[PDB]
Design a protein around this ligand. Structure first.
Ligand SMILES: NC(=O)c1ccc[n+]([C@@H]2C[C@H](COP(=O)(O)OP(=O)(O)OC[C@H]3O[C@@H](n4cnc5c(N)ncnc54)[C@H](O)[C@@H]3O)[C@@H](O)[C@H]2O)c1
Ligand SMILES: O=C(Nc1ccccc1-c1cn2c(CN3CCNCC3)csc2n1)c1cnc2ccccc2n1
Ligand SMILES: [Zn+2]
Length: 273
């Protein structure tokens, strides 16, 4: 069986160079991103005023059209520039500057990856972005700030053409994933180390994508617990690092060498925040 020390070594030795990364909800825990399933949080109570068939309706269309506000209360809350990224994101970015990040796939819609300084050439925001939008009728792309003005002031924006409701480019149920997800196919075979952090591997196709990388590719899970297929039938080259995702990450960071360089980077980056 492998271990953190082991994986560390392969990254240093330069025998891992082609690192694909899967993040979900847990990387953007330490940054503050409140869950609307968990009570006791601005967002939770705010979304209770609106009566809601069931939590998912927030990301269903037919409902959205019957009443957006629930979705928008959330948009307002996550709109760029109210949540810093944390150390988990800033490693991923360091991973990048070291020439190692093949691609980073995320089920998160906080865009904390971008704001951490990862170029979007490297990201695949599989559940969408807030940085754009689209009249639900008369069809036009709109940049993100174009509507922000309203979003912060609680109003539900319209196209200056349709007057149809402009909707941020969060993927809703019933729709298929961003086109961008077509790398699904090249990235995974091209990967020589898969890195799974802060995800429960529960939503599709992330469950599936973990079994994509080749047979002999190690999967370093860093999570509160062991999940998905890494649990339900693991591979010899899997190595789990259970625990807080940060005391996971900063552990690795040392094993490799970069405790220093990490701090340096977090300095430049939160002097600009
Ligand atoms: N920040 C966000 O954008 C955000 C927030 C909440 C939910 N989501 C959605 C929820 C889901 C994302 O991934 P998903 O697999 O579903 O997340 P999940 O919320 O269902 O699971 C999170 C996983 O991480 C583990 N975990 C959570 N926090 C930590 C932590 N702080 N340290 C170590 N381990 C932790 C937890 O056990 C679980 O296995 C998608 O539907 C997202 O769109 C996104
Ligand atoms: O309860 C939360 N998350 C989910 C839990 C279970 C199942 C689905 C989603 C869930 C689904 N979903 C979609 C839609 N899906 C896209 C992919 N296939 C089609 C459907 C876009 S974002 C999102 N989360 C949840 C989600 N986002 C949050 C964001 C900020 C704060 C708290 C949040 N809590
Ligand atoms: Zn329009």
């Amino acid at each position: 069986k492998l271990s953190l020390q082991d994986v560390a070594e392969l990254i240093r030795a330069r025998a891992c160079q082609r690192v694909v990364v899967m993040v979900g909800a847990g990387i953007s825990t330490p940054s503050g991103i409140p869950d609307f399933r968990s009570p006791g949080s601005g967002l939770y109570s705010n979304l209770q005023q609106y009566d809601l068939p069931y939590p998912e309706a927030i990301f269903e269309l037919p409902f959205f059209f019957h009443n957006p506000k629930p979705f928008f209360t959330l948009a307002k809350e996550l709109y760029p520039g109210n949540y810093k990224p944390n150390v988990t994101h800033y490693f991923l970015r360091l991973l990048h500057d070291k020439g190692l990040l093949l691609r980073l796939y995320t089920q998160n819609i906080d865009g904390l990856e971008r704001v951490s300084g990862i170029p979007a050439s490297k990201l695949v925001e599989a559940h969408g972005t807030f940085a754009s939008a689209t009249c639900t009728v008369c069809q036009r792309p709109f940049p993100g700030e174009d509507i922000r003005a309203d979003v912060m002031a609680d109003r539900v924006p319209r196209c200056p053409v349709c007057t149809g409701v402009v909707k941020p480019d969060i993927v809703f149920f019933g729709e298929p994933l961003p086109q961008r997800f077509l790398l699904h196919v090249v990235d995974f075979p091209m990967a020589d180390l898969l890195l799974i952090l802060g995800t429960s591997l529960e939503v599709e196709p992330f469950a599936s994508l973990t079994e994509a990388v080749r047979s002999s590719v190690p999967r370093l899970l860093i999570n509160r617990d062991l999940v998905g297929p890494l649990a339900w039938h693991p591979r010899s080259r899997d190595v789990a690092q259970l625990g807080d995702v940060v005391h996971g990450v900063e552990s690795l960071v040392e094993l490799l060498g970069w405790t220093e360089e990490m701090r340096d980077l977090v300095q430049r980056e939160t002097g600009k925040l």
